Amino acid sequence: ERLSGNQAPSLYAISLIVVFLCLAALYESWSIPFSVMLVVPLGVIGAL
Amino acid sequence: MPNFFIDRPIFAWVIAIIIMLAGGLAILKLPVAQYPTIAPPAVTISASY
Amino acid sequence: VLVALILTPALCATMLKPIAKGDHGEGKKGFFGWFNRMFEKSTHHYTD
Amino acid sequence: SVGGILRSTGRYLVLYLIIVVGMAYLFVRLPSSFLPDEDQGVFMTMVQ
Ligand SMILES: CCCCCCCCCC[N+](C)(C)[O-]
Ligand SMILES: CCCCCCCCCC
Ligand SMILES: CCCCCCCC
Numbered sequence: 001e002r003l004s005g006n007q008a009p010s011l012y013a014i015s016l017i018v019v020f021l022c023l024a025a026l027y028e029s030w031s032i033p034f035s036v037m038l039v040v041p042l043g044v045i046g047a048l
Numbered sequence: 049m050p051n052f053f054i055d056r057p058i059f060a061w062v063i064a065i066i067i068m069l070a071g072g073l074a075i076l077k078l079p080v081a082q083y084p085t086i087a088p089p090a091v092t093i094s095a096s097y
Numbered sequence: 098v099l100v101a102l103i104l105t106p107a108l109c110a111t112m113l114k115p116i117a118k119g120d121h122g123e124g125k126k127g128f129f130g131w132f133n134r135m136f137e138k139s140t141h142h143y144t145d
Numbered sequence: 146s147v148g149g150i151l152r153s154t155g156r157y158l159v160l161y162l163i164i165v166v167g168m169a170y171l172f173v174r175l176p177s178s179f180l181p182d183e184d185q186g187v188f189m190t191m192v193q
Contacts, residue, residue, distance in 0.1 A: 014069070014073070017069070018066065018069070021062045021065055021066055021069075022062070024058055024059075024061075024062050025056075025058065025059040025062040025063075028056055028058050028059060029058065030058065038161070041161075041164055041165050042164065044168050044172075045164055045167060045168045045171070048168060048171035048172055048175060049102050049103065050102050050103075050106045053102075053103045053104070053106060053107045054106050054107060054110045056107070057107040057108070057110070057111050060103050060104045060106075060107035060108075061104070061107070063103055063104070064100070064103070064104050
């Protein structure tokens with residue numbers, strides 16, 4: 001428990017960043033990806 | 049490939065940014081030293097009479 | 098070589114300012130104006 | 146039904162922010178463990 005442990009929040013941050021970048025390449029837009037990225041909390045709410 | 053990314057400049061940026069991000073995260077975990085293991089390994093047998 | 102085939106061409110097509118036909122920066126003001134005239138002159142020396 | 150939602154637009158953006166705050170609350174509220182205790186068809190009794 002002491003040395004290392006809680007590294008999940010950083011990996012979730014990296015996950016969403018890389019997904020946004022990959023979406024940006026797919027659509028060739030910095031803005032359009034947000035239309036997909038805004039759906040994430042609509043899924044997480046159900047799990048919780 | 050050049051003509052592909054000439055029309056797709058955001059794609060070109062994405063590839064570069066992902067490479068840079070991967071590199072940034074690597075620097076945090078990468079160990080630091082003067083040299084790597086350049087010295088050949090040794091084994092010593094110690095006995096007493 | 099990957100950066101030069103992917104990123105560099107994309108930036109050249111979007112970021113580079115148009116250069117007029119015949120312009121070699123010989124008409125620039127200050128140091129860069131002097132250096133361009135020096136180099137253009139040095140190129141003629143070399144080719145000859 | 147979707148046709149009527151797009152006429153409103155701004156209304157459902159406020160509902161979205163409540164879901165994000167609702168999601169944020171449940172996540173903070175939810176206790177955290179590693180792996181649940183499983184019934185393995187066996188257990189031990191300590192006598193001291
Ligand atoms: C470190 C990431 C910064 C990327 C910003 C790129 C957008 C600026 C415009 C450049 N352009 C896309 C026209 O080549
Ligand atoms: C760490 C990831 C940064 C993402 C870059 C976004 C590009 C800006 C668009 C103008
Ligand atoms: C860039 C080199 C210029 C000098 C050429 C030599 C002429 C004698």
